[PDB]
Paper text:
To test if the DNA and protein length variations induce structural changes in the complex, we set out to co-crystallizations of a shorter p52 protein (aa 1–327) with all three PSel-κB DNAs at various lengths. This short p52 protein only co-crystallized with a 13 bp PSel (mutant A/T-centric) DNA but not the (natural G/C-centric) or (−1/+1 swap) DNAs in any lengths. The conformation of this complex is nearly identical to p52-MHC-κB complex with minor groove width less than 4 Å at the central position. This crystal with short p52 is in a different crystal form compared to the three structures with the long p52, and it is also in a different crystal form compared to the MHC-κB DNA complex, suggesting that crystal packing is unlikely to be the main cause of the structural differences, and that both the DNA and protein lengths play significant roles. Therefore, we observed an influence of the length of the p52 protein on the conformation of the κB DNA and the organization of the p52:p52 dimer in the complex. The same Arg52 in the complex with the short 13 bp PSel (mutant A/T-centric) or the MHC-κB DNA only hydrogen bonds with the O6 group, but not the N7, of G at ±3. In addition, Ser61 also makes direct contact with A at ±6 and ±7 positions; these contacts are not possible for the short p52 (aa 1–327) co-crystallized with 13 bp κB DNAs such as MHC and PSel (mutant A/T-centric)-κB. p52 monomer II makes contact with only three G(s) from position −3 to −5 (right). Interestingly, all other NF-κB-DNA complexes, including the short p52:p52 homodimer bound to both 13 bp MHC-κB and PSel (mutant A/T-centric)-κB DNAs, exhibit more backbone contacts by Gln284 and Gln254. The short p52 protein (aa 1–327) failed to interact with Bcl3, partly due to the lack of the GRR.
Mammalian NF-κB is assembled combinatorially from five subunits, p50/NF-κB1, p52/NF-κB2, RelA/p65, c-Rel, and RelB, into homo- and heterodimers which bind to specific DNA sequences, known as κB site or κB DNA. The DD alone mediates protein homo- and heterodimerization; the NTD and DD together are responsible for DNA binding; and the NLS region is flexible in solution and together with the DD forms the binding sites for the inhibitor of NF-κB (IκB) proteins. The mammalian NF-κB p52:p52 homodimer together with its cofactor Bcl3 activates transcription of κB sites with a central G/C base pair (bp), while it is inactive toward κB sites with a central A/T bp. The p50 and p52 subunits bind to a 5 bp half-site (5′-GGGNN-3′), while the RelA and c-Rel subunits prefer a 4 bp half-site (5′-NNCC-3′).
Numbering used by the authors:
A (entry chain A): 33 to 326
B (entry chain B): 34 to 327
The structure:
DNA sequence: GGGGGTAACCCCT
DNA sequence: AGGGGTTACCCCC
């Protein structure tokens, strides 16, 4: 890895949640895939660096599947750093060996397009390392992949693949490094697949007993995949949950839940705990609101 | 007017709750019912010929909401319907009433509207010397199409019943004056969804006071909705919920402050009604009860 | 038949 | 740029 030569490292991953993939018709300039630690105070973008080598290199980025045999995604990166359809590319000058990708879009392919767009991509890979032409059998078989790749491909999750290149024999940058794959990126427009947000809730306080019903208004969530985690910041690390049925999650924008019992029963003074929305599979949370026992 | 044979609508179509279908959804999702239809007792739009007995054939077709009845981009579909989107039932000499019991409304896409429009307009304008007329005036036919498309509501249609008697010279081309029904809103157009209240966090509050209530509702438009409190007639009293558009959360929840009752310091608590109402429409939801306490 | 939800698109500020 | 909402489509039971 780190002493089999020069290698890439992702200095700043893409933000896994909250980024919207755009269909070609929505427009060309709706805003860039940011870094995992971006915020409106200070913006960050996915960043990578070449280690163990200095001097000109070219880093390309392209979308691969969520699946770990990393395969090219039907979706395309779009933006300033990209070509006609040719993928996004940044140049590392020798002093600073790190590349920011600060204007990266994800063009959403329609299902009605997916196969055509994918054959059009597999061809290119066939005519990449391997020789110049495709026999009809060569092509019937390429179309195979397309069909059985469309059955199993998640159009709401992508991974960036950074492919770093160095000047080969002729000075043409076609001698590559091992490619480095980022953490998965969810489409904020896939239902309930954005980041958790607590808009407002109707009670801020209840009895230490628990069982008090609270109306929580949130951004779109999945009835089946959401929870309401109460907790304390301390060495005790106490946690409890909201009590609700799926029918209690109203049209993916509200949760009617009954508060959990506090870890003690006879508090002398009123105690503030935190609650947060949490994703069941994933573990990402919303910003916590305070709740006071007694 | 009893100055000839004439059509009368015995049973109008239901104004609200009927869904218009796009061609791709399917062909057989259920019939436009009568204004007084109900579960178990179904009615369908019905019309009758008066001042005449014997054979007629009645067509129905979709006209604009706009009072100069014009042909709508949408077409009637289903059991009784020819390719051309005009439906016909034949009225036998004994019973002079026609039920249309299996009527669909095929929703044209906006991308289809022009072609669908030029095509219904040509067919309309094709009687006299068709071959050389058509070409001469299709540029200035297309003028209507453009200026008809920007001003046509695809969420409201009217049935137009056109009755035709047997002209024994040829047959069945003899026209009666056409009768236009009351309007039919697409239940899937946001502006026409049936208003429902799911749940509410308080069911009582202080008479001549406004408390904050969380209301969970079906889809509403922030700018077109209200919360009407009302009684079984005492002084035909009504008051409203207090909330700004910001208070209508993702079209499925309303955070509002209850209005004061008309009569401060009531002897004991009084139950009033509350309901969602569209501002312009005048359609409302089934009312929930609210109790004013002193 | 009759729904409920997801996918693609539009357009405001 | 970044949204908020409508339009078109899918598919369950």
């Amino acid at each position: 890895e780190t002493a089999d030569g020069p290698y890439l490292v992702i200095v700043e991953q893409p933000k896994q949640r909250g980024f919207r993939f755009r269909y070609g018709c929505e427009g060309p300039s709706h805003g860039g895939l940011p870094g995992a630690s971006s915020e409106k105070g200070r913006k960050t973008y996915p960043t990578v660096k070449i280690c163990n080598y200095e001097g000109p290199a070219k880093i390309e980025v392209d979308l691969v599947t969520h699946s770990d045999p990393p395969r090219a995604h039907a979706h395309s990166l779009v933006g300033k750093q990209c070509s006609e359809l040719g993928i996004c590319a940044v140049s590392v000058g020798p002093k600073d060996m790190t590349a920011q990708f600060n204007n990266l879009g994800v063009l959403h392919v329609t299902k009605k397009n997916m196969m055509g767009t994918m054959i059009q991509k597999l061809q290119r890979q066939r005519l990449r390392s391997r020789p110049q032409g495709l026999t009809e059998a060569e092509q019937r078989e390429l179309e195979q992949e397309a069909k059985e790749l469309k059955k199993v491909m998640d159009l709401s999750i992508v991974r960036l693949r950074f492919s770093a290149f160095l000047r080969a024999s002729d000075g043409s940058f076609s001698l590559p490094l091992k490619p480095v794959i980022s953490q998965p990126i969810h489409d904020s427009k896939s239902p309930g697949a954005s980041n958790l947000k607590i808009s407002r809730m109707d009670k801020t306080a209840g009895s230490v007993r628990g069982g008090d019903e609270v109306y929580l208004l949130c951004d779109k969530v999945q009835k089946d995949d959401i929870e309401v985690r109460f907790y304390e910041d301390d060495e005790n690390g106490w946690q409890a949950f909201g009590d609700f049925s799926p029918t209690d999650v109203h049209k993916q924008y509200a949760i009617v839940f009954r508060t959990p019992p506090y870890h003690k029963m006879k508090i002398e003074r009123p105690v503030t705990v935190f609650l947060q929305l949490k994703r069941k599979r994933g573990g990402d949370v919303s910003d916590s609101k305070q709740f006071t026992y007694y």
